[PDB]
Symmetry: C2
Subunit: 213 residues, 2 copies
């Protein structure tokens, strides 16, 4: 499977293609305080194991000094929580990266890519997106076109062209995921967008074939 | 590694990134009679083994009924020769596809994709190109933009944007490979082409973001 996420000035956008715990886009929320999204591209067993470890600590942790998603004071600390779950899930496709993002009150929205051993890197304005899965579809186009000042809707359109897809748009400082949408191949808007993209690409190539190589 | 080839009305274009027998683009020729190009994306040992088997039969075959690249009456028969070498090389990265194309006098230029067991498919006007390697870079762009009536130079430009690269252009009915070029990352023409492509893509996206999804 394939998933992708963008960090913009205005917020975060998450997308993944596709039984709740095995779902490739996972959401956690405390109203007005914190929101988190995990994207997976690994096999079903790997996704479930990581989510189960996160939820085990949210639901049953007795030690107050252990950090969970709901006690993490910032998104770096929250990413370490997921990193620990990703590493520990190896005890429970199996060696794919995860994407984790969200926002905690008092701090900007942040986005991370988590590796098999629980280490991670964070999205920057220079590198505002991550892709995970067997094939990072349309990476060259995202590299050339993605910008951190893009509106959330236009980022979503670019992401959808790189690919049913679960799409989540998170607006900065809202601490809720309201804009949640499932888009199938039979969606007429998405088909219309893809048709226009193909037309625009052919026109784009017709311009640049002026140049020699 | 990555390689790609196009079959056009005007001829064939081959490209591969990169010690002669391990080279990822391999050429055979009989002047004015036949030309062949093999592209590999597998490991070094796999490429050498296939080429060695092809050359063994060209150089040492004593049985006249055994088909070689130089006795094949048509390109389908020549593809079977390579297919046999690809399958037999498994006895000698290891499970990647090959691309094989060329022309024999009395017949149009033809292009094939060879699978690990020696079976193959042929390029058509509807599907005029093949890609091989770990990552089929820029497949969505080739799918949307590639056309069988493209000039050889414009096909080459499109192929180069999907990626030092060894580029071969074969013009129909010539039975020679004269237009052979090695293009590095420091090539100013290729850099200029890539810069313009990025600019054109951003402009292309700016047009199509009119549409909703
Ligand atoms: Na900009
Ligand atoms: Na056309």
């Amino acid at each position: 499977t394939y998933a992708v996420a963008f960090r913009l000035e205005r917020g975060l956008v998450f997308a993944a293609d596709t039984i709740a715990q095995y779902k490739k886009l996972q959401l956690w929320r405390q109203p007005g305080e914190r929101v988190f999204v995990l994207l997976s591209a690994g096999n079903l067993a790997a996704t479930q194991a990581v989510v189960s470890l996160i939820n085990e600590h949210l639901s049953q942790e007795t030690d107050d000094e252990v950090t969970t998603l709901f006690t993490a004071p910032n998104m770096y600390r929250a990413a370490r929580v997921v990193g620990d779950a990703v590493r520990e899930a190896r005890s429970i496709g199996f060696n794919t990266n995860f994407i984790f993002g969200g926002q905690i009150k008092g701090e900007r929205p942040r986005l991370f890519q988590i590796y098999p051993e629980g280490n991670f890197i964070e999205a920057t304005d220079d590198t505002p997106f991550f892709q995970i899965g067997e094939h990072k579809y349309g990476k060259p186009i995202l590299d050339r076109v993605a910008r951190s000042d893009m509106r959330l809707g236009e980022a979503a359109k670019l992401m959808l062209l790189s690919f049913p897809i679960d799409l989540v748009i998170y607006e900065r400082d809202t601490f809720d995921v309201t804009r949640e949408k499932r888009i199938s191949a039979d969606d007429e808007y998405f088909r219309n967008l893809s048709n226009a993209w193909s037309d625009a690409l052919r026109q784009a190539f017709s311009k640049i074939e002026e140049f020699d190589v």
